[PDB]
Design a protein around this ligand. Structure first.
Ligand SMILES: [Cl-]
Ligand SMILES: [Cl-]
Ligand SMILES: [Cl-]
Ligand SMILES: [Cl-]
Ligand SMILES: [Cl-]
Ligand SMILES: [Cl-]
Ligand SMILES: [Cl-]
Ligand SMILES: [Pt+2]
Length: 129
């Protein structure tokens, strides 16, 4: 599923991500934009052989099982495929765990390089929220 900007912001709110660990909804929409271009089916294979999945490009080294990341963990207790669903519930539940892990949203390199410190509110501007 490819979400519209306001559509995703709505879904993120409905699932409790808005101001989660102090990060406003715009932060989460921005991160989703640059990680997946709002496409739930986004995947990216890394040099280390791990793979990133879903709207928030959650990575198989720690967070989900895909059966092909030697030495990895599955801290979200989910198959990585669940992160590709049209329903973002699994992605959001997992993102809550990742953003709680110590480094906030810096866990998402694209958030740090393209969203952090910017006018993130622009991402939710105009949306009926
Ligand atoms: Cl957009
Ligand atoms: Cl915001
Ligand atoms: Cl597992
Ligand atoms: Cl594995
Ligand atoms: Cl599994
Ligand atoms: Cl959803
Ligand atoms: Cl923080
Ligand atoms: Pt739901």
């Amino acid at each position: 599923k490819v979400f519209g900007r306001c559509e995703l912001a709505a879904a993120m709110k409905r699932h409790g991500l808005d101001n989660y660990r102090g990060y406003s909804l715009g932060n989460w929409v921005c991160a989703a934009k640059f990680e997946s271009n709002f496409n739930t089916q986004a995947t990216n294979r890394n040099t280390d052989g791990s793979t990133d999945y879903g709207i928030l490009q959650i990575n198989s080294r720690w967070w989900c099982n895909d059966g092909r990341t030697p030495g990895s963990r599955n801290l979200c207790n989910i198959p990585c495929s669940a992160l590709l669903s049209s329903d973002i519930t699994a992605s959001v539940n997992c993102a809550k765990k990742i953003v709680s892990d110590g480094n906030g949203m810096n866990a998402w390199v694209a958030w740090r390089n393209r969203c952090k410190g910017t006018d993130v509110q622009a991402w939710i501007r105009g949306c009926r929220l």
